[PDB]
């Protein structure tokens, strides 16, 4: 719902892909995380509370997840096509996306 419970969905999900053990499992993870980044796209963070919505700022953050949804898309492929390992490898490039955008808007 909020931003805070979609964070929790993201750091959720991608620890359940870590542990996971077949592609399916994955996929479904990656699922939820999609839904979670889109949901989130639409929030306003608190540290940009004072900005215009139509601020550079407010579109930087909007952009950020649109990046996040491709790659989580790219690793739905692999996962859909039963390659655990790789859509776990492909899952682990998010990462450093997160802190991009955390150490500007977190
Ligand atoms: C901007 C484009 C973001 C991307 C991509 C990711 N996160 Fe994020 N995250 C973002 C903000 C603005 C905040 C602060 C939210 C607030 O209301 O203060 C956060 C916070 C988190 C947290 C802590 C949330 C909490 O406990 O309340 C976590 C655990 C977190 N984010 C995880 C996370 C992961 C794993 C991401 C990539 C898969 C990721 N975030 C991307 C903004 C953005
Ligand atoms: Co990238």
Same mark, same amino acid.
């Given at each position: 719902? %909020? &931003?805070? *419970?979609?964070?929790?969905? &993201?750091? *959720?999900?991608?620890? #359940?892909?870590?542990?996971? /053990?077949?592609?399916?499992? $994955?996929? /479904? @993870?990656?699922?939820?995380?999609?839904?979670?980044?889109?949901?989130?796209?639409?929030?306003?963070?608190?540290?940009?509370? !004072?900005?215009?919505? /139509?601020?550079?700022?407010?579109? %930087? +953050?909007?952009?950020? +997840? /649109?990046?996040? #949804?491709?790659?989580? *898309? !790219?690793? &739905?492929?692999?996962?859909?096509?039963?390659? $655990?390992?790789? @859509?776990? @490898?492909?899952?682990?490039?998010?990462?450093?996306?997160?802190?991009?955008?955390?150490?500007?808007?977190?």
């Amino acid at each position: 719902a %909020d &931003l805070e *419970d979609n964070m929790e969905t &993201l750091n *959720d999900n991608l620890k #359940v892909i870590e542990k996971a /053990d077949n592609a399916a499992q $994955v996929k /479904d @993870a990656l699922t939820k995380m999609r839904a979670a980044a889109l949901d989130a796209q639409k929030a306003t963070p608190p540290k940009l509370e !004072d900005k215009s919505p /139509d601020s550079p700022e407010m579109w %930087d +953050f909007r952009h950020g +997840f /649109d990046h996040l #949804v491709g790659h989580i *898309d !790219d690793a &739905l492929k692999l996962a859909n096509e039963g390659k $655990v390992k790789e @859509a776990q @490898a492909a899952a682990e490039q998010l990462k450093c996306h997160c802190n991009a955008c955390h150490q500007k808007y977190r």
